[PDB]
């Protein structure tokens, strides 16, 4: 349930700490983002010694949603603090070497199982 101009957390060791997504993708009049999506972000707070720098605009994938996901058996997986993983703009490969926090199993259907390979918790 992530929309335009939404402040999210960062769930990788790329270097960003506080991030603000600016453009959700999927089609015309794309309202809100689910759990597995390509969303464009702008860096608002990052360590000066990190791999990235403040103000850079690039793509990212949400991993945790405050609203949650919808299991096909009437179940939801809510979270406390929406988070993203850094991905390159031209290529869809993620930047961070490690992933912090659990990632839901629903990301397999969205075809980003590499994130699921990381983040040993769940």
């Amino acid at each position: 349930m992530i929309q335009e101009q939404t402040m999210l957390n960062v769930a990788d060791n790329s270097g960003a700490r506080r991030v603000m997504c600016i453009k959700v993708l999927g089609g015309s009049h794309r309202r809100y983002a689910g759990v597995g999506d390509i969303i464009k972000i702008t860096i608002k707070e990052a360590i000066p010694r990190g791999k990235v720098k403040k103000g850079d605009v690039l793509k990212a994938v949400v991993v945790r949603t405050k609203k949650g996901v919808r299991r096909p058996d009437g179940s939801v997986i809510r979270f406390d603090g929406n988070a993203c993983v850094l991905l390159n703009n031209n290529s869809e490969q993620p930047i961070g070497t490690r992933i912090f926090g659990p990632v839901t199993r629903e990301l397999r259907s969205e075809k980003f199982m590499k994130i699921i390979s990381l983040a040993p918790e769940v």
Partner: protein, 102 residues
């Protein structure tokens, strides 16, 4: 189909110049992945050639892979065979990430 599929891929990937293979047991640590096998390729062409081969034979092997990751980029590509996961890599980007305690 645990060790049977594990032995089915390690021998055949070696026949296609599969170097520096590590067999990892992750049982009890992750509930999504069973066995982590690591493959290394010389460059972008080599890792792509073996990646297409392993999914081409899987189609004729009965089991359907559940997805791929490498698109217009050979920095990281990983494909699945269900219970077993296979990671084909290159020398430069492997040391950038962490090895053998995933």
């Amino acid at each position: 189909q645990g060790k049977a599929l594990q032995d089915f891929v390690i021998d055949k990937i070696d026949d296609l110049k599969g170097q520096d293979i590590i067999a990892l047991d992750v049982q009890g640590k992750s509930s999504i992945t069973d066995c982590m096998i690591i493959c290394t390729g010389t460059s972008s062409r080599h890792v792509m050639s073996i990646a297409d081969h392993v999914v081409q034979e899987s189609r004729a092997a009965g089991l359907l892979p559940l997805g791929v990751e490498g698109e217009n980029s050979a920095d990281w590509i990983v494909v699945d065979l269900g219970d077993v996961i296979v990671h084909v890599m290159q020398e430069e980007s492997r040391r950038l990430y962490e090895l053998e305690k995933l």
